[PDB]
Design a protein around this ligand. Structure first.
Ligand code: MG
Ligand code: MG
Ligand code: MG
Ligand code: MG
Ligand code: MG
Ligand code: MG
Ligand code: MG
Ligand code: MG
Ligand code: MG
Ligand code: MG
Ligand code: MG
Ligand code: MG
Ligand code: MG
Ligand code: MG
Ligand code: MG
Ligand code: MG
Ligand code: MG
Ligand code: MG
Ligand code: MG
Ligand code: MG
Ligand code: MG
Ligand code: MG
Ligand code: MG
Ligand code: MG
Ligand code: MG
Ligand code: MG
Ligand code: MG
Ligand code: MG
Ligand code: MG
Ligand code: MG
Ligand code: MG
Ligand code: MG
Ligand code: MG
Ligand code: MG
Ligand code: MG
Ligand code: MG
Ligand code: MG
Ligand code: MG
Ligand code: MG
Lengths: 185, 222, 148, 58, 49, 51, 127
RNA sequence: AAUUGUUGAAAGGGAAGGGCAUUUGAUCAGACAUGGUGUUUUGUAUUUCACUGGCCAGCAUCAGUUUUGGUGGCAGGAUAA
RNA sequence: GUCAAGGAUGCUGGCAUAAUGGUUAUAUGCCGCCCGUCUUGAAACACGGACCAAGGAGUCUAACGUCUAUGCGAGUGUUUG
RNA sequence: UUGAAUGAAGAGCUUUUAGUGGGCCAUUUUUGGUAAGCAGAACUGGCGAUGCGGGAUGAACCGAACGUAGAGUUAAGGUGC
RNA sequence: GGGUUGAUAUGAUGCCCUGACGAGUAGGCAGGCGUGGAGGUCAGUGACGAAGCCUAGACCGUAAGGUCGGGUCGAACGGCC
């Protein structure tokens, strides 16, 4: 008999491997497991953790987001590392020359990077040209910009986007949504 | 290789230097224990000769053993037992006696037997039941190197320095005592005495303050 | 895949995951959206406020092709020029050869000014524009022409 | 049918299963409820401070 | 009943709808029938297009 | 692999604690005290034997 | 002879028979956990049958090993049999139940030629 | 399969069945080979040949955990009374 | 170099098979109330169950929520044709 | 020794959904009652959901909570049989 | 919680080191066992006997179950992804 102060046999609650059956992603996890164990640079631990992430935890990083990251002071010649998908952005009309190391590139993103004299890199070419993650810049896409996150924590006076199928007048704009009909939220 | 032979010779020389340090520290500790004991005895004799009474210094350290099991404990004494790391029956901890811990002991009095440990029972507890906490992972002590690797920043290089920080409640008593995992004691080898355990020691039971009689019980449990 | 359902894990267990007390029954709270004003008011208010009642004018015989007006912001606007003709227009930002962007033929009814076209003049043929979209196009050096 | 009306038995145990959580105080609290005359001024004092700091830094 | 935070659905299945389910298993067969009829018609209305 | 016990196993009692050899050589745990001749006061003795 | 193994400890040699399988013929001896609310076997009263749990698990060094010290590999023909050419001290062949009498002869002869142990070298033997 | 007959075995003082453990009866699986220096050898190289591994133990020297004795040296107190 | 120092080795005996062990029946010691179920509470003097074989109960669909895997990604969905 | 002691088993956060929404007992404080194995509250600990050792027997008492085993030691209770 | 890649070593949902823990209804989740049929595969088993069925005969698995021997039998049926 032991007076337990915690839950016994509690899992860590973190992914220790990707849920995917992608053999190439398992190869990348094998390489960055070696590089997290044997290098003791914190980049490799971060990249190994980020390789486990799900599709909603790997939002796409736009090329405009990459260019805004290179507009930082002294970050213009770093290697932008996106553990995920790099997507195109037609809203930006001037993309610089840079090295981007990502899992996937869309065709427009790859064309926009290599049109400006840049270079698109996989995460193992990054591992051979920056094994401690020297001169790198990890970028992450926006997580709370997802459409599902609008409805999270829905309640009174939270302003959190009702789960609705059709949107308009007659569709939840009445008693409970204005002073005149009933009350306001 | 020859460089590996150089590292082996360097390691053995460093080990001899560390053992010389530990040996002279243990000799100094034995000398100060002997002189403090003789000084208290002669202070009592001198006060009896002068006609006065030497009031001994109040005890700075208790050893606390949880004697009552897991079920049917109220939440406040249960929380105090968890904060004193007595999470199972016959678990012992060293507790620094101040007012902030005497009112913990008063709260968990019906569930523990505590008293004032001597150097002999501290030495036997740390020698036989002495385990560390290293990556929390309960490492058996067994070697002065794993005490130097964790308590060496506080100047503790050996199991005797660790014992010294307990018996003389040192500046780093908290760190040494929290390095010590709670002592998993057995049931006492000659019984408890006491046909029923859960009355006070004054009333013929086991719990409560057992001032200098905790050494007999803990040596039976060890 | 019937084998991956938890019915096959509930084989052998009596209540099938539904309870010995609660005892899965037919329709214990009503059927459908029953009792949204009475015994599901705490669910209708809180997660669906506004479900009950009327809001404004009824529209008899609405045709949604009257209201067809898809909006194109100015931060796109150059995606309507094809990808290989686009760069030779971006360089040599010139009047007397300015790209005509028929936006109705691309399928938009209103131009909005969400932001930052380059400083190249364009002819923008559009059914409707907003004020800031017009100001930004004339600031870049072009003109909006209205069509129908 | 006569039965138990109300009891607070087990409620403190359930309350302390997932702990009793303190409300996680922040630097820069919300100005909800603070005096509007103070708020309208403080917006301008902050705007002028940031303007003067940008002028002194550049 | 109405339950947890979920959108309000308007599934119009409160009639005897199972008497009127038209499943188009015959999509491929009617495609071959349409092509056969076009070939047959073209042979009937030779050279006319 | 196995926790050998000091307070048995003099090899482990000498691996830990290099002073155990000196303690066992000088006997150091059976050492005689100096015979002082302090006599208690009559006030202490008559308070002790006092009714 | 096999590889040297530790002494095989089984920890529960008795078969885990179902409750009341001795009492009703409809209840077979195949183990079913009693999920009843008042079940003495489920509640583990003293005097009742033991239930299978993971503490009875065999030692991993001596698990799946026959008393000879071999794992049994089921063999249907000679091509199955010669998978154990380099694993004779670890694996023992065992001819499947549906193999002919005339094919068991050549399986047994090839296994003797390879040194592979057969655990049933007596099925369908003409005597 | 329920149910039944015969034969064989077994047990049986107001149930029977079951758990742990062993006695008794019945019944059954598993292992001696091995590498080996050695030629008293026949079909002249086949082979001449005490080793080895299976089951149960006895003692000795140890290690771990304990239990039960014998005995020695110190310390304290009203430096016992 | 040795050792009792990061976990047993040395020497010897008998047997080499029902001897150890397995299964099985029985006997003995102690324990063991009939399961399912509703229940605050079941061995209940609560309900179902005489026994056996076969059959027998969270399925499919429309529209969705969360999560996850995949493809492409400001796009995306070939399969109405 | 960065502003008391002790502990910290990682801390913080989010989504989603099952069951449940008949309770009951015990020490102490209590209301209605003459009282209850009555009806009703407060705090805690239990039973429900839980076996084990003891109270001969019993849901709640006492001791103690449970993987499979070996050895030791005990708790509550006992030691004429 | 860690260790392990310039034959780790070709099992890196591997091997290994270290420490703690293990009760459970309703319920949740995970890893597996079995069944009818389908794609692939073993150039799988089989009239020299497939499946079935009987078997206080044997083996493996904590278990779901799997495997084998004997009898009966007579035309088909398994392993793995
Ligand atoms: Mg004893
Ligand atoms: Mg089941
Ligand atoms: Mg269950
Ligand atoms: Mg039910
Ligand atoms: Mg119109
Ligand atoms: Mg160990
Ligand atoms: Mg078995
Ligand atoms: Mg079994
Ligand atoms: Mg069964
Ligand atoms: Mg019950
Ligand atoms: Mg029959
Ligand atoms: Mg009679
Ligand atoms: Mg010994
Ligand atoms: Mg035999
Ligand atoms: Mg026997
Ligand atoms: Mg009985
Ligand atoms: Mg209930
Ligand atoms: Mg019952
Ligand atoms: Mg009946
Ligand atoms: Mg019936
Ligand atoms: Mg059936
Ligand atoms: Mg309710
Ligand atoms: Mg109620
Ligand atoms: Mg109910
Ligand atoms: Mg009253
Ligand atoms: Mg129960
Ligand atoms: Mg009991
Ligand atoms: Mg008792
Ligand atoms: Mg009684
Ligand atoms: Mg009695
Ligand atoms: Mg009590
Ligand atoms: Mg015992
Ligand atoms: Mg469990
Ligand atoms: Mg099939
Ligand atoms: Mg064939
Ligand atoms: Mg057959
Ligand atoms: Mg039978
Ligand atoms: Mg036929
Ligand atoms: Mg089959």
């Amino acid at each position: 008999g032991i007076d337990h102060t915690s839950k016994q046999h509690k899992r860590s609650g973190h992914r220790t491997a990707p849920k995917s059956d992608n053999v190439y992603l398992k190869l990348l996890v094998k390489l960055y497991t070696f590089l997290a164990r044997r290098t003791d640079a914190p980049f490799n631990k971060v990249v190994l953790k980020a390789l486990f992430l799900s599709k909603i935890n790997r939002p796409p990083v736009s090329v405009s987001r990459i260019a805004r990251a290179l507009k930082q002071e002294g970050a213009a010649n770093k290697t932008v590392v996106v553990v995920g998908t790099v997507t195109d952005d037609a809203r930006i009309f001037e993309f610089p020359k840079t090295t981007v190391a990502a899992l996937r590139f869309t065709a427009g993103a790859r064309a926009k990077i290599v049109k400006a004299g840049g270079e698109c890199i996989t995460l193992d070419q990054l591992a051979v040209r920056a094994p401690k993650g020297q001169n790198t810049l990890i970028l992450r896409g926006p997580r709370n910009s997802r459409e599902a996150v609008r409805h999270f924590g829905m309640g009174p006076h939270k302003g959190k986007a009702p789960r609705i199928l059709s949107t308009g007048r007659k569709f939840e704009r009445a008693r409970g949504r204005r002073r005149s009909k009933g009350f306001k939220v | 290789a020859e460089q590996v032979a150089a590292e082996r010779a360097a390691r053995k020389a460093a080990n001899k230097e560390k053992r010389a340090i530990i040996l002279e520290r243990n000799a100094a500790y034995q000398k100060e224990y002997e002189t403090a004991e003789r000084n208290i005895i002669q202070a009592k004799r001198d006060a009896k000769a002068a006609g006065s009474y030497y009031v001994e210094a109040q005890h700075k350290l208790v050893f606390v053993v949880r004697i009552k099991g897991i079920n049917k404990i109220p939440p406040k004494p249960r929380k105090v037992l968890q904060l004193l790391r007595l999470t199972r029956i016959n678990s012992g901890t060293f507790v620094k006696v101040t007012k902030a811990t005497l009112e913990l002991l008063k709260l968990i009095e019906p569930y523990v037997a505590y008293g004032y440990p001597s150097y002999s029972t501290i030495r036997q507890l740390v020698y036989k039941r002495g385990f560390g906490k290293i990556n929390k992972q309960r490492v058996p002590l067994s070697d002065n190197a794993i005490i130097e690797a964790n308590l060496g920043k506080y100047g503790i290089l050996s199991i005797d320095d660790l014992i010294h920080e307990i018996i003389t409640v040192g500046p780093h008593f908290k760190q040494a005592n929290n390095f010590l995992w709670p002592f998993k004691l057995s049931n006492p080898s000659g019984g408890w005495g006491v046909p029923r355990k859960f009355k006070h020691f004054i009333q013929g039971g086991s719990f409560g303050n057992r001032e200098e009689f905790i050494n007999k019980l803990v040596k039976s449990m060890n | 895949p019937s084998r991956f359902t938890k019915t096959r894990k509930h084989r052998g267990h009596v209540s099938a995951g539904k309870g010995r007390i609660g005892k899965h029954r037919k329709h214990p709270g009503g059927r459908g959206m029953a009792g949204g004003q009475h015994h599901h008011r705490i669910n209708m208010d809180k997660y669906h406020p506004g479900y009950f009642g009327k809001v404004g004018m009824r529209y008899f015989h609405k045709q949604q092709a009257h209201f067809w007006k898809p909006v194109l912001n100015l931060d796109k606007l150059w995606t309507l020029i094809p990808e290989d003709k686009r760069d030779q227009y971006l360089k040599s930002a010139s009047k007397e050869t300015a790209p005509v962007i028929d936006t109705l033929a691309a399928g938009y009814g209103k131009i909005l000014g969400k932001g930052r076209i380059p400083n190249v003049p364009v002819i923008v043929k559009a059914r409707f524009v907003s004020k800031l979209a017009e100001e930004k196009i004339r600031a870049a050096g072009g003109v909006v022409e209205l069509i129908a | 049918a006569k039965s138990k009306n109300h009891t607070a038995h087990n409620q403190t145990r359930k309350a302390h299963r997932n702990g009793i959580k303190k409300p996680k105080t922040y630097k820069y609290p919300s100005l909800k409820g603070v005096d509007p005359k103070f708020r309208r001024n403080h917006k301008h004092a902050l705007h002028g401070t940031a303007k003067a700091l940008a002028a002194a830094k550049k | 009943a109405i339950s947890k935070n979920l959108p309000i659905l308007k599934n119009h299945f409160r009639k005897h709808w199972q008497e009127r389910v038209k499943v188009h298993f015959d999509q491929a067969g009617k495609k071959v029938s349409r092509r056969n009829a076009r070939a047959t018609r073209a042979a009937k209305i030779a050279p006319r297009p | 692999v196995l926790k050998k016990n000091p307070l048995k196993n003099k090899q482990v009692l000498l691996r830990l604690n290099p002073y155990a050899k000196v303690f066992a050589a000088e006997k150091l745990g059976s050492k005689k005290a100096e015979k002082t001749g302090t006599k208690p006061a009559a006030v202490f003795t008559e308070t002790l034997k006092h009714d | 002879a096999s590889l040297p193994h530790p002494k095989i400890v089984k920890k529960h040699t008795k078969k885990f028979k179902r409750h009341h399988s001795d009492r009703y013929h409809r209840v077979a001896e195949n183990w079913r956990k009693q999920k009843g609310i008042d079940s003495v076997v489920r509640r583990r009263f003293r005097g009742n049958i033991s239930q299978p749990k993971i503490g009875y698990g065999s030692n991993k060094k001596t698990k799946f090993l026959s008393p000879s010290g071999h794992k049994t590999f089921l063999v249907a023909n000679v091509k199955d049999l010669e998978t154990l050419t380099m694993h004779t001290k670890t694996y023992a062949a065992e001819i499947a139940h549906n193999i002919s009498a005339k094919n068991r002869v050549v399986i047994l002869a090839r296994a003797k030629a390879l040194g592979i142990k057969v655990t049933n070298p007596k099925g369908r033997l003409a005597l």
